[PDB]
Subunit: 414 residues, 2 copies
Amino acid sequence: SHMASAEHSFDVNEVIKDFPILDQKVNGKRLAYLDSTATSQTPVQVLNVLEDYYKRYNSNVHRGVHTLGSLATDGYENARETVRRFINAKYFEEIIFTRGTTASINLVAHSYGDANVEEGDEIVVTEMEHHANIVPWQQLAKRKNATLKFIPMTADGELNIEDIKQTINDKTKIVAIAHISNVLGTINDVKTIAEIAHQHGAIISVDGAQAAPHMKLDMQEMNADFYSFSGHKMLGPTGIGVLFGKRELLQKMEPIEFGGDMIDFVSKYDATWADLPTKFEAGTPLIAQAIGLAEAIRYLERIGFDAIHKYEQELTIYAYEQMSAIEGIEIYGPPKDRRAGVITFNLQDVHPHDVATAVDTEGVAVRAGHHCAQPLMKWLNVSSTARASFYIYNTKEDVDQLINALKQTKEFFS
Amino acid sequence: SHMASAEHSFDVNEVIKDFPILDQKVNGKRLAYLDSTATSQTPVQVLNVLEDYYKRYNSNVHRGVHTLGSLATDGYENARETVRRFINAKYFEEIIFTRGTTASINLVAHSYGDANVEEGDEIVVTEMEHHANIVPWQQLAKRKNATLKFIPMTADGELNIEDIKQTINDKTKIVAIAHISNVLGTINDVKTIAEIAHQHGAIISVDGAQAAPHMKLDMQEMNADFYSFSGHKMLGPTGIGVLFGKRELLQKMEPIEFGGDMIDFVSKYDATWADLPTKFEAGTPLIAQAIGLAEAIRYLERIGFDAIHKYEQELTIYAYEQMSAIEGIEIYGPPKDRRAGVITFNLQDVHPHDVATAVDTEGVAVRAGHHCAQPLMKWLNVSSTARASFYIYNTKEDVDQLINALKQTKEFFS
């Protein structure tokens, strides 16, 4: 088929050999892991770099120290440089390591938000946002008596340019938006939204958790003010994310966590802060996790995003077409050729929790629930949905295993 | 010798076989890693558990999901239970995972501090505190126009009961104190200080980063309100720590980071919070790191703290005596038999940065600088010091290698 050709061109079988977790059975059936949107699997190259760190040069990080300490510092600094190049940030000091996208957005909303939002200012969000890109803005609005505004969505769950222009105005201080929806697969035009924000004297904070794993990012082209993502969704270790911020903005923002490393001087009653980026990195860093995340970036770069985007789009269109052919499947969001590698759906007369349970019995991992997007579920007029997602280690066989399992589930519940 | 006997009894050579990082040379000399206070080394048992997680059951965490997801959730919940038992917390929900001791103390100071400290209240600290246990209290005092008070220290860097009783009064709301000093080796009587706090209607927040790796902790006996520590100092992975808090207190405290997992329900403008402990755990957890930290706890428990305390005390007394015999060495803090496994020192007429550089050329890893304790350095009337620290994988040979390197350093600079 067309999908066999896409598999062969991408060399997907050689990619899968790097992911030992996929070589197992679940409930006696081969594993078809279709939940990468929740967290990705991790290649041996990343695991080998983590093992090497702990077996060869673990130490705390500080410029000019004993031998292992200076190797650990080199590895941590090299990891930040790898991230800077990955997203084409202008400066090393514009990359902040955090616990994840959620911690990144919370740092923007506390540190930037409290210094730049007052009573009567507006913060623009959307109903497709993950909780991590809604609730911090709700809390900033409550602290400041500011107003939260939602960009109206089209019937297919996209943002029309005229709705974007009508919602952003000269009262807007912050536009906070997903680059890619974790549910609908919508790809927002963040470059254009940034331009409209900037015309009104607002800044843009982008939730890029579902974009960084899947497409090339260029902070300078996009002209985002802040951009946030998570390592565990892009082949990296748990516990690490990134906040990109323009240097001019980060310089004026105050830290919100205090301790070692982020200080320059401490007396009994006062303290001064370190330079960027360490101003925002209190305590001992995520040292092993940063080193592993840099290896995950090199894994993605070695394949390249043009190859990853083509393969993911072929998988996604194939899955969308095969799932659409099952009578009773409803897919939410844009058409097959206008979406990222996610399909959120319901099966007529079968609760999505029972879909997820049933396909796991067939070896297939999907998620069911609200996907941390309760306002989106309400916008769809549902409580829960089921969600399959694709990444670089998925195959036609994985999609066909889901399709057969859904047909078996229809039969079981009929 | 007495130290050879202690080595043999502890089976230190078998412990060292678990730490492949120690089996290397630095500058052509065997590695003598004497910087565990900064971060510990990591045994293969912990590395094997981390590798197994990524090769067998990585997935995001949620009760009742697909097979790998339910294994990851089990591992994360089991890890929290392991921590609860390790410190004898009454309830599972009193254990919060954080990024580290610094993040733990910052959560207390923001969430508990802002709700319980007002103008004219007092916060008690000490000049031996790490920056992580000073600067958050400075910032809480500034937010609230409250007053920071310091418990006077004895000439040996300890806290006299009469100075403790004179500094704590009915205005005190929070006593924030180290269990063990990262510099002096002082072991504070936190059980007694907690009693004095409680008599005055204050709470106690304990910095236990240097105690959790080295001694048995019992939250119920101690009667601490909050207790904070870091995994990387106790054989665990980087990027994880613990906050213990009494359930009654944590129930009333508000979260300070917002997103997925920590919410129950989200609408466009409002949100409700999850139950403890997840109320304080926004975003995707530190899943691999928690699982590794539980394995580190089982490694320490298998040896037991009575054996670890005896071995560390024998090493410490041996090192204190051998270093004291070098003319020109000044050791800071209490006597050899009243300290934890740390020796902070200076060598007459040799800057401590040059000591650290010189002994690294001899394969020995120590730290030089302020040790994130600038107010303590000022209290000692120095800028910088050098610091050697001991843990379960250190030997008489490591101490003798430091002693010979210090004598060689004296010679080089004379």
